[PDB]
Amino acid sequence: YKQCHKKGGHCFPKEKICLPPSSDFGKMDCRWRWKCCKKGSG
Protein backbone atom coordinates (compact mmCIF):
# COMPACT_ATOMS: atom_id res chain seq x y z
CA TYR A 1 0.00 0.00 0.00
CA LYS A 2 2.99 2.49 0.32
CA GLN A 3 3.00 4.25 -3.06
CA CYS A 4 -0.79 4.65 -2.85
CA HIS A 5 -0.51 6.35 0.57
CA LYS A 6 2.36 8.50 -0.87
CA LYS A 7 -0.12 10.23 -3.21
CA GLY A 8 -2.50 10.35 -0.15
CA GLY A 9 -4.36 7.51 -1.90
CA HIS A 10 -6.40 5.54 0.65
CA CYS A 11 -7.41 2.75 -1.84
CA PHE A 12 -10.94 2.76 -3.40
CA PRO A 13 -12.94 0.70 -5.95
CA LYS A 14 -13.23 1.99 -9.54
CA GLU A 15 -17.04 1.88 -9.02
CA LYS A 16 -16.74 4.63 -6.35
CA ILE A 17 -15.61 7.12 -9.06
CA CYS A 18 -13.61 9.78 -7.15
CA LEU A 19 -14.40 13.24 -8.56
CA PRO A 20 -13.25 15.84 -9.25
CA PRO A 21 -10.37 13.99 -11.06
CA SER A 22 -6.52 14.36 -11.04
CA SER A 23 -6.37 13.35 -7.34
CA ASP A 24 -7.68 9.84 -8.42
CA PHE A 25 -4.71 9.44 -10.92
CA GLY A 26 -5.37 5.81 -12.00
CA LYS A 27 -3.59 3.33 -9.71
CA MET A 28 -0.41 3.35 -7.62
CA ASP A 29 -0.12 0.15 -5.59
CA CYS A 30 -3.73 -1.07 -4.99
CA ARG A 31 -5.26 -4.40 -5.95
CA TRP A 32 -5.07 -4.95 -9.68
CA ARG A 33 -8.59 -3.54 -10.51
CA TRP A 34 -9.11 -1.05 -7.65
CA LYS A 35 -7.86 2.60 -7.93
CA CYS A 36 -6.74 5.37 -5.53
CA CYS A 37 -7.57 8.98 -4.78
CA LYS A 38 -6.19 11.37 -2.15
CA LYS A 39 -8.23 10.67 1.07
CA GLY A 40 -11.10 13.09 0.34
CA SER A 41 -14.22 12.87 -1.86
CA GLY A 42 -17.33 12.10 0.26
Swiss-Prot record:
Disulfide-linked positions: C4-C36, C11-C30, C18-C37
GO annotation (BP), single: envenomation resulting in occlusion of the pore of voltage-gated potassium channel in another organism
Tissue specificity as recorded in UniProt: Expressed by the venom gland.
Site (Involved in the interaction surface toward Kv): Y1, K2, R33, W34
Other facts: Negative results: has no hemolytic activity. Has low harmful effects on normal mammal cells. Does not show activity against the filamentous fungi A.fumigatus and T.rubrum at concentrations up to 125 ug/mL. Does not directly affect voltage-gated sodium channels Nav1.1/SCN1A, Nav1.2/SCN2A, Nav1.3/SCN3A, Nav1.4/SCN4A, Nav1.5/SCN5A and Nav1.6/SCN8A.
Subunit annotation: Monomer.
Function: Cationic peptide that possesses multiple functions. It acts as a cell-penetrating peptide (CPP), and as a potent voltage-gated potassium channel inhibitor. It exhibits antimicrobial activities, hind limb paralysis, and severe muscle necrosis by a non-enzymatic mechanism. As a cell-penetrating peptide, crotamine has high specificity for actively proliferating cells, and interacts inside the cell with subcellular and subnuclear structures, like vesicular compartments, chromosomes and centrioles. It penetrates into the cells as fast as five minutes after its addition to cell culture medium.
Keywords: Antibiotic, Antimicrobial, Disulfide bond, Fungicide, Ion channel impairing toxin, Myotoxin, Neurotoxin, Pharmaceutical, Potassium channel impairing toxin, Secreted, Signal, Toxin, Voltage-gated potassium channel impairing toxin
Protein name in the entry: Crotamine
Single annotated GO MF: potassium channel regulator activity
Species annotation: Crotalus durissus terrificus (South American rattlesnake)
Listed GO CC annotations: extracellular region
UniProt superkingdom: Eukaryota
Coiled coil: none
Subcellular location field: Secreted
Family statement drawn from the similarity comment of this UniProt entry: Belongs to the crotamine-myotoxin family.
UniProt motif (Nuclear localization signal) ranges: 2-18, 27-39
